[PDB]
Amino acid sequence: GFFSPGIWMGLLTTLFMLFIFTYGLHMILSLKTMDRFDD
Amino acid sequence: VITFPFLFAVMFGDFGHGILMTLFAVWMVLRESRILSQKNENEMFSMVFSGRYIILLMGLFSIYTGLIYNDCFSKSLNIFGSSWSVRPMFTIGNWTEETLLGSSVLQLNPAIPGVFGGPYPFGIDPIWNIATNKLTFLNSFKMKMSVILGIIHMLFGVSLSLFNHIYFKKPLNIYFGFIPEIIFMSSLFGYLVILIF
Amino acid sequence: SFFPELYFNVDNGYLEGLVRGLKAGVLSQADYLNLVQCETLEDLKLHLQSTDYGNFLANEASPLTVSVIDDKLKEKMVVEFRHMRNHAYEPLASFLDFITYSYMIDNVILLITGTLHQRSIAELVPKCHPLGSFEQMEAVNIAQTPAELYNAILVDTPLAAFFQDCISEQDLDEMNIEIIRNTLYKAYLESFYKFCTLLGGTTADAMCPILEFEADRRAFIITINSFGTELSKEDRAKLFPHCGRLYPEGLAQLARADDYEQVKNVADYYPEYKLLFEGAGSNPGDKTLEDRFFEHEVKLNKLAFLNQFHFGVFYAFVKLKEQECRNIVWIAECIAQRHRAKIDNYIPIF
Amino acid sequence: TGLELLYLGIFVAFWACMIVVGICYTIFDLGFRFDVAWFLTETSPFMWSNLGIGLAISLSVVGAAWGIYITGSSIIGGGVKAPRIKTKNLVSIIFCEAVAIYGIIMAIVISNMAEPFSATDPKAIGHRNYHAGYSMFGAGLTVGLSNLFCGVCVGIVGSGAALADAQNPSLFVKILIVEIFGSAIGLFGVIVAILQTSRVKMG
Amino acid sequence: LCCGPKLAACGIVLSAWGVIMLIMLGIFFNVHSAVLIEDVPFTEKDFENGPQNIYNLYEQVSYNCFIAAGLYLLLGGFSFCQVRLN
Amino acid sequence: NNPEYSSFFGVMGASSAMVFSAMGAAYGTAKSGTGIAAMSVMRPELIMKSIIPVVMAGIIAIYGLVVAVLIANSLTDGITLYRSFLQLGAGLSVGLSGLAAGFAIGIVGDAGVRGTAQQPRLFVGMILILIFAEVLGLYGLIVALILSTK
Amino acid sequence: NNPEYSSFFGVMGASSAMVFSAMGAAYGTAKSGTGIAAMSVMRPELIMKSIIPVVMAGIIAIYGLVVAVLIANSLTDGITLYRSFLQLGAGLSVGLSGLAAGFAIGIVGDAGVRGTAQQPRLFVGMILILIFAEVLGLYGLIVALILSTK
Amino acid sequence: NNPEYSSFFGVMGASSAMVFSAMGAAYGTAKSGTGIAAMSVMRPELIMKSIIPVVMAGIIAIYGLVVAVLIANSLTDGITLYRSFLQLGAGLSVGLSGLAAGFAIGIVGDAGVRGTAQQPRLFVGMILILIFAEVLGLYGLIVALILSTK
Amino acid sequence: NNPEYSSFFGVMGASSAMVFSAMGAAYGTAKSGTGIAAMSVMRPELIMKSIIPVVMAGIIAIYGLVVAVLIANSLTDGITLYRSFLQLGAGLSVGLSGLAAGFAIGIVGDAGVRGTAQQPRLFVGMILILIFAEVLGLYGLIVALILSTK
Amino acid sequence: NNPEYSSFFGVMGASSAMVFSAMGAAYGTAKSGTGIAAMSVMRPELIMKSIIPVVMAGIIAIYGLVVAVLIANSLTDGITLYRSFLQLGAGLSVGLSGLAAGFAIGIVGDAGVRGTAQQPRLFVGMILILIFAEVLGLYGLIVALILSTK
Amino acid sequence: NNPEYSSFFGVMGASSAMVFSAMGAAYGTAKSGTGIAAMSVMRPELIMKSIIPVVMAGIIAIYGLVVAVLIANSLTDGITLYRSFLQLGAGLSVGLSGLAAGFAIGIVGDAGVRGTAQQPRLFVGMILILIFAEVLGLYGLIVALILSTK
Amino acid sequence: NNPEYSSFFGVMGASSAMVFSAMGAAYGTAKSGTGIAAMSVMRPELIMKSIIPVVMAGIIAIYGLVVAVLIANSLTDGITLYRSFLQLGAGLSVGLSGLAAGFAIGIVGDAGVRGTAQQPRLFVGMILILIFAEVLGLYGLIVALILSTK
Amino acid sequence: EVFDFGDTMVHQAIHTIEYCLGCISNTASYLRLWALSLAHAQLSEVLWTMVIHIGLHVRSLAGGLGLFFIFAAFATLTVA
Amino acid sequence: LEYSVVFNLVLWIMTGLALAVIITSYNIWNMDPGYDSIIYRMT
């Protein structure tokens, strides 16, 4: 088979890790820095 | 003045809804003087009133077409009796209480001579309105009808150009328009008409 | 919709609250009526000092003057907008920069007029409106060379993109400077509309109406003014900004137009403006088209705050407070010069 | 729009693969290979239960925090010129945090549902046990997302509330009704989760 | 009791239409026409003995139509009363 | 007896009902709420009138909850795969329907509240539009009830 | 010898029929509603003549409900694979037809009601275009019932 | 004899024929309608004649409908996979070809009406391009009918 | 007896517990420190008071660390699949919770520091709000511990 | 007994421990360097003292190196899946934790240095924020080391 | 005897090794070149000093080449999967780490060169930051070398 | 014997060797040409020298052709899977390396010519940089040759 | 007036294309009649079964009141 | 026998490799050429 029980469980686990990781990395990459400062 | 009520009736074909439209049409038409005097700002209502006569003819033709469809609120009228029949299947065919028990929807067939005594004299037979196969018959009939009606209408249209070209004395128009145009129609789609009959 | 609510506050959350808090501080109708009763400029200071404007004006010499009040109001607005821009993040920072661009274009017009006429460029800056200040030293020490100024603006000033509609420094002497000003304003307004649309979402929904009224009022006022001028119809059309609702064939009819009656004929097709032209009697003693246009504009900026997550609130605040500065200046005029009869011509805010 | 274009691309690729593979399996008659039953059965119930609980807590916390900062940004900004805000509009924060409270309650409740098997064969594991797995996963998913959405809702409305209060003191006490209705959605999620787990037993 | 004349007029027209349509339906149901069969609350056991049972249930529905037509008659009288009251 | 894995789809049916209904209700509530908050400062006399749309969003939420409870009670460890699919159908029908309804309620409420802030006469039309919008979720609830009970 | 998994497709037909028609109706109500709200500030007398698009979106929704309920009634515990696929076809046909028709109804209503606000003569053009749009949902309904009843 | 899943592709064809062509018709309707509502403001006398694009777009929907119903009546429980493939091909042909056509009609009509508002002569060229747009849907019908009949 | 791959899920739990918490902490500190600098340039005297949000980010990081090491302690060779998934649940529970808490602490910190810069009265409000975010991290940690010690 | 493909997950532990910490350090040095360059043009005498953030990014890198080298040393041929997974877990724990830490270092260093150019006293605060971010990488190292040795 | 497909992972290690290193080097050269060009128009005297970041990227290129040559030389037709996986690990570790170093080198080179033209004092710091960027690629090379030789 | 589908990877090796090198050279040619046009308009006299970057992109094209042709001449039916994967590795190694080199050459050519129009003496640094960019493709070729001839 | 071969031939080409394609399309269009008529029948039947079948399909005499209410509903829904 | 594991390893490793390549190419493709001091003289 193209998959096994263990592999399927592993892929589900890694996919639900990757969802979280992509969310986190998106937000962290949207971080920005200001170009100016006050007086 | 006629064909618009006609085709709208082909679409809206229903005895009962035709009654309702004719009722509204007359309710307007008889009181038209009162409405004309006490006109109001309701744009939609005023436009419908303006169209009352059109609505009247539209309702009458919907009555006629609904009867022809054997449709009155989607139901049949039963007056002339069914052309299809049931018992001759038992007698000449092979149905039995066992069949009526074990085949929920069974069938009916015109092949055996005892079943069908000829087409319903006016409109479609009432049995279809209760028959599950209703769509198979009605779709083919209505499809192919709409076809015949539309093509005949279009040929009528082609003809109507000749009376323009005659008065305007456009011999080229006649010769290399109408004649070729009408031949193309009749040959292609008028021929489909011939076949459907 | 672009669901801005989900992420707008992540960066703009603080400045949203701050700009609304400032908005709350603009004078109300009650404060206006209070000020209309003032007996002197000193009394005006005393009354205004109880408002949110507070002690700002008290720092300056005993003989208050209209120019002084105007300078102080402007300066306070400058400081506040500088604060906002300093704390803004990139997108909102670009939006605020777009706000500043208008004043920058005005300053460039002043600079060009000065150089073509050969006057010391540095001495023009003091009168330049601070919101459009040129930090870029490239725009300084031009030695009054028009070519040098043109290259400096193209090289180190954001206005290069709009100047691309022009082709050379000789354009600065080829045309009356007002043509150039309105050309730059057209390009800037169009680019600003495009920027708001690209941002999309609630910011578009709130800001685009303001911009279309800007464009349409520009078209109308330009056309009415052109008639007593040598401005050709082709120039008028070329100067119309296209983001206005008048764009389909309305701008064409304005171009064809030759009379106030004809601009009105165009207005007849756009009711929300039609009411403005109807109310603008424009005869002596009652409201003019400009007054009605300011009234409608303030209405629009007022309504902008009916939306929460967008940048348009900042443009609304800037223009509302600018109109408020002009209002207070006008009130100071009426008090100082004792034409109390006309003071009510200001536009009320919120 | 870099990263969003990436997500769109990977999404399109994944569903293109799903569609094409489905058509190919059907055309080749591999419905016996493609039997979802094998997937659902050999994926251990523990995985379902535990993803369920983890989401139950974590999605609830996500809603809580998301709404929390959405309203807190506004509360602070408005408070700049309206110091009265800080004590009053904090009810938005508290109603945001109630979502994570629900998160814990249901997370630990579900955690009380788990037990080992000492079985590997699906027949030995049994209907009760597989049902326990799926039911826990579903209840967790439900509570987690209901809480997430309640949280984002409450946060947004609370931000609006603080900003409104900045301009007028009196309005806040009335707008809070929308906040209450927002919290009601999370409560509905909690109720549904309770019912789903009410008749679950591992072992 | 009183109400706006337009609502009362709608009431009378509705009542008249109800009376007419339900009179038609009751007539045909009492005739036991096949066209309306599926609306009959027939039961599986009935299709063993003979068609008289289904006739009686046809008549039940027919009576029920006549009853609703009666309620429509009362409604029509009521709405006409209000119309002339206005 | 029925297959071991059968109950999965019924579980998902209940979860989908509640979750997608919650998504719909949350969006509608939040959108109407931002509209209400923005309007309040301008026309404070209209707050208790302008609330209604939030009540409509809550109605969508209730629609979700009813179906969810029904599936939860109908659910057991030994359901037929057929009834499990039907429970999933009921759940999705009410849930996604409620989501669409929720977007409708949110957008219409926001726009209408904004309008009435400027022009009171819009109010009744806004109520009518809101009713037609919630009616969308009502249809989903009807179909879900039928599917579940069948 | 009817596979138990086959019945899923009928449930999905019913779902789709409800949900996609619902989303179409929701968008149609939404855009027409924002248009109406924008218009009402300036031309309140047009509210009732302008709500019609919302009614038409409602008709899209009723089309969805009709098809979905019919599919539900036709469903059975041992439904054949052929009939179940027919029901899925009906569901998708009606649902996506409603989605498209609703998109059209919403956009048309928005743009139009706004157009009438400045130019009342357009009303007739609106109603024509709106019905032409609703006709797409009618076609979806036609096909859907044909498949669902075969 | 024949694989039982054959009917799935037949119903897919039946659906596709209507749904995709309907999406195309919907988009055309929408764009043309916005164009009509825009042009009406300046030249209100042209609306009825200028509706011709929406009138033409509905035709793509007619085409979708005809192919859909033809696939439908061709369907039965035991069709061979070959026939099911032909049905799928016909459905996809008419549907997606009509989608391309609909994009064409939408864009062309939207531009054309707005242009005509400034230049009445364009109308004729608009009609010409619109015909060249509809013929794409027509060709899709031709191929779909041939396939479905074979 | 037990499958050979069982340890992978526990390992993933530990790694997630560390990593998601770490990312949340990183985002929090970055945002907070940005705000701290921005306030600093104008108000040098507030640095020591202002640093607090970064400290709470450190707290969420510590929460991640404790949970992660606790899982690592339980990562035994003969780990039953049951314990392995319990540890994965602990991992996700703490991890996503911490990521969200980091977002909240960071954004609130930036907003609060900027506000304090202008309005000293807000500082107590800052802290009071921030605690309600950090308690979320406490919540995730609690559930993770319960799971790991089931 | 030692599935043949076990070596893969240990190898990935190594690869991640290197690459992700490297990416974190890279972003840190990058953003900090842009900040250093920007500040230079105004405040030359700060240049040497300003480089600390880049140093701490390099420490992120060295954390990656320690974990990766230990992992490689532990990569024996006949590794058990248990240890291979622990080895991957260490790899990810260090690598992604360092990625987050480096992101934090970069943003904070940029902000801090440019602020310091404007206001010297920010220097100590910046160092403190950098430390509180760097401890994130330290925790990544600690968890990775624990996982690897266990 | 070993599985024939093992060769794939060794060749993949070679390919990844050279490719990611090359891409990082390309980015570094390109952005540094843009910086150099922008700088030169002012200060042509700084060309030879400014070229250094491009050389620093070429260093990453050389690292990639070194590991890739080692991998290619070590490949054999009977390579064990352990060694093949190990080669893949070496390739990833150098290549992706070099990509990170490449982004670092490029960005810092661009910014630093531009600043240096404005302020020559920056140059020393620009060197130090360049070196810190490269030691990332050096760490990648170290890990990859250890892996490739084990 | 080796499975029949083995030569897949060799043929892909050749095709990619041509194709990706082609993509890189195309991009470099493109950007270089844009820059060349821009510079030429103002400084036509500099064209003959400024074309050089496009030549160096053609060099990448040459690398691609050489490796692709080598692989093609090496292909055989009874090719060992190991040799096939070697050829795939070589093809990728030249191709994507040339992609990186073409990227670098394109950006450098654009920027450098654009500057050169304004300051001729930049030519030296430009040429050096393009050398540094082309040696990337050279490295790709060296790796590819090793892999393929091995 | 004046004759141009190109313009006149393109005019007749436009008319020919218009005519033939218009005929094919109009023939297809007239199927609109069938489509909308079947729509009328289908809507009528399904509304019948969804509303008044409810009242007609009850056993006791109370269905008389049931039919009153359900027929009010049916009347309004049909008109609408 | 190990078809599942070998296939998944190949698929996901190649997916990661392809995505890494595509993203790196995207980032460079959009690399800012950064001649802002020159752009407006050229245009």
Swiss-Prot record, chain A:
Task: Spell out the protein name for this chain.
Answer: V-type proton ATPase subunit S1
Post-translational modification (record): N-glycosylated.
Q: Which gene encodes it?
A: Atp6ap1
| Stretch of the intact protein here | 413 to 451 of 463
Cite the source lineage.
Eukaryota, Metazoa, Chordata, Craniata, Vertebrata
Q: Which family does it belong to?
A: Belongs to the vacuolar ATPase subunit S1 family.
Give tissue specificity per the record. Answer: Expressed in brain (at protein level).
**What is the species listed in this Swiss-Prot or TrEMBL entry?**
Rattus norvegicus
What residue ranges are annotated as transmembrane?
Answer: 1-21
Q: Write out the function statement from the record.
A: Accessory subunit of the proton-transporting vacuolar (V)-ATPase protein pump, which is required for luminal acidification of secretory vesicles. Guides the V-type ATPase into specialized subcellular compartments, such as neuroendocrine regulated secretory vesicles or the ruffled border of the osteoclast, thereby regulating its activity. Involved in membrane trafficking and Ca(2+)-dependent membrane fusion. May play a role in the assembly of the V-type ATPase complex.
Cytoplasmic topological intervals = 22-39
Q: Where in the cell is it found?
A: Endoplasmic reticulum membrane; Endoplasmic reticulum-Golgi intermediate compartment membrane; Cytoplasmic vesicle, Secretory vesicle, Synaptic vesicle membrane; Cytoplasmic vesicle, Clathrin-coated vesicle membrane
Whom does it interact with, and what assembly results?
Answer: Accessory component of the multisubunit proton-transporting vacuolar (V)-ATPase protein pump. Interacts (via N-terminus) with ATP6AP2 (via N-terminus). Interacts with RNASEK. Interacts with TMEM106B (via C-terminus).
From Swiss-Prot, chain B:
Which species expresses this protein natively? Rattus norvegicus
**Transmembrane segment boundaries:** 1-12, 15-31, 47-76, 141-160, 179-197
Query: Which residue intervals are topologically Vacuolar?
Result: 13-14, 77-140
Q: How does it assemble?
A: V-ATPase is a heteromultimeric enzyme made up of two complexes: the ATP-hydrolytic V1 complex and the proton translocation V0 complex. The V1 complex consists of three catalytic AB heterodimers that form a heterohexamer, three peripheral stalks each consisting of EG heterodimers, one central rotor including subunits D and F, and the regulatory subunits C and H. The proton translocation complex V0 consists of the proton transport subunit a, a ring of proteolipid subunits c9c'', rotary subunit d, subunits e and f, and the accessory subunits ATP6AP1/Ac45 and ATP6AP2/PRR. Interacts with SPAAR.
Task: Supply the name of the protein.
Answer: V-type proton ATPase 116 kDa subunit a 1
Q: Where in the cell is it found?
A: Cytoplasmic vesicle, Clathrin-coated vesicle membrane; Cytoplasmic vesicle, Secretory vesicle, Synaptic vesicle membrane; Melanosome
* Disulfide links within the chain: none
Superkingdom of source: Eukaryota
From Swiss-Prot, chains F, G, H, I, J, K, L:
InterPro entries the record matches: ATPase_proteolipid_c-like_dom, ATPase_proteolipid_csu, ATPase_proteolipid_su_C_euk, F/V-ATP_Csub_sf
Q: What Gene3D superfamilies would the database entry show?
A: lithium bound rotor ring of v- atpase
- Membrane topology per the record? Multi-pass membrane protein
Q: Which residues lie on this side of the membrane: Lumenal?
A: 72-87, 148-150
- What's one GO BP annotation on this UniProt entry? positive regulation of Wnt signaling pathway
What transmembrane ranges does the database entry give? 6-28, 51-71, 88-109, 127-147
Highest rank taxon of the organism: Eukaryota
Q: Which GO terms describe its cellular component?
A: clathrin-coated vesicle membrane; membrane; proton-transporting V-type ATPase complex; synaptic vesicle; synaptic vesicle membrane; vacuolar proton-transporting V-type ATPase, V0 domain
Q: What is its main location?
A: membrane
Listed GO molecular functions?
Answer: proton-transporting ATPase activity, rotational mechanism; ubiquitin protein ligase binding
* Keywords annotated in UniProt: Cytoplasmic vesicle, Hydrogen ion transport, Ion transport, Membrane, Synapse, Transmembrane, Transmembrane helix, Transport, Ubl conjugation
Q: Which residues face the membrane's Cytoplasmic side?
A: 29-50, 110-126
The post-translation modification note in this UniProt entry reads:
Ubiquitinated by RNF182, leading to its degradation via the ubiquitin-proteasome pathway.
Annotated localization: Cytoplasmic vesicle, Clathrin-coated vesicle membrane; Cytoplasmic vesicle, Secretory vesicle, Synaptic vesicle membrane
What family is this protein classified in?
Belongs to the V-ATPase proteolipid subunit family.
Protein's name in the database: V-type proton ATPase 16 kDa proteolipid subunit c
Task: State which gene encodes it.
Answer: Atp6v0c
Swiss-Prot record, chain N:
Part of the whole protein covered: 301 to 343 of 350
Q: Which domain of life is it from?
A: Eukaryota
Q: Which residues lie on this side of the membrane: Cytoplasmic?
A: 24-43
> Taxonomy-wise, where does this protein's organism fall, top ranks first?
Eukaryota, Metazoa, Chordata, Craniata, Vertebrata
Protein name (database record): Renin receptor cytoplasmic fragment
Query: TM segments?
Result: 3-23
Can you name the source organism? Rattus norvegicus (Rat)
